[PDB]
């Protein structure tokens, strides 16, 4: 009895996984100035809209 | 003499566009169409 590994298939599947990972982790969304979600008081109308 | 052979194949083209499956960012295809309009005549109808 003996054991050996097929390198080509392993690396093909790993390459697919690598491309998937590259398409997810790398991206960065740049956003500077926004609305405020923390409200100190009760302001009625405008608070409800932006919270929604 | 006796014994013949039958092969089974798919078409291809010299010029083909590039598309993005989930796994591969670059895979070539025979013919494709864009889904985003990007050019305007500059006139109102």
């Amino acid at each position, epitope marked *: 009895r003996g054991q050996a590994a097929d*390198l080509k298939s392993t690396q093909a599947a*790993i390459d697919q996984i690598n*491309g998937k*990972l590259n398409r997810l982790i790398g991206k960065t969304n*740049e956003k500077f100035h926004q609305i405020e979600k923390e409200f100190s008081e009760v302001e009625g109308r405008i608070q409800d809209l932006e919270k929604y | 003499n006796s014994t013949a052979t039958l092969c089974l194949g798919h078409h291809a083209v010299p010029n083909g566009t590039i598309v993005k499956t989930i796994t591969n*960012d*670059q895979i070539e295809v025979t013919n494709a169409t864009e889904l985003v309009q990007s050019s305007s005549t500059g006139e109102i109808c």
Partner: antibody
Amino acid sequence: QVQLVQSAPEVKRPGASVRLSCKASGYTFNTYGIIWVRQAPGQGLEWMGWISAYTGNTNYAQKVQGRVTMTTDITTSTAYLELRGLRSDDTAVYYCARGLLQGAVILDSYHYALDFWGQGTTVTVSG
Amino acid sequence: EIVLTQSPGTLSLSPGERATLSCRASQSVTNRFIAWYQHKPGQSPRLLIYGASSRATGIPDRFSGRGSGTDFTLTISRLEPEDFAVYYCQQYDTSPRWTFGQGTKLEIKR
């Protein structure tokens, strides 16, 4: 430490074929690929091709697709670049940097970049 | 292909000043690729910044990399005599392919 030792300077006649050697020490050879990039006189670095130690797969530059053949040898961690049909423009300094990790999934971008570089071999082709 | 254009091609700056080197991408690329390399005359090229902002081992912390999408920049502070060289910028295609940069020359001192 991780180290890459290239071949010797060469002089060739136009139309001949040249073979270049790159040897790896320290790191496990089969895990990373070997990537060849050249610098022509007064020119920026120019990618040529990539060979894998895990797989036999090769990718070549469009300008040198026909004329370039790249091989790998596990014993002992030696990568060979053969350029045929040499032309005057091929006079350059050829480097062999370490390439992508062909053994496992990749999250650090360190393996997706060329890190350890050889000294380089100068090939001058003229009649 | 993804052609890369390097801004200013030659930069002159006295020792001890911050320097900014620009690499402009023809198409948008993830920050995962687009690493930054150093070439010293008569010496093998060296890796300074891998990925986008990560610092390679043994690289002085004065070197910093940054950027997104089309625009990527390399910033050097407290410029010392070791730093003067040519700098290159590169990325990767899914089928292994590595387009490099034209070359920014840091010929400096006044």
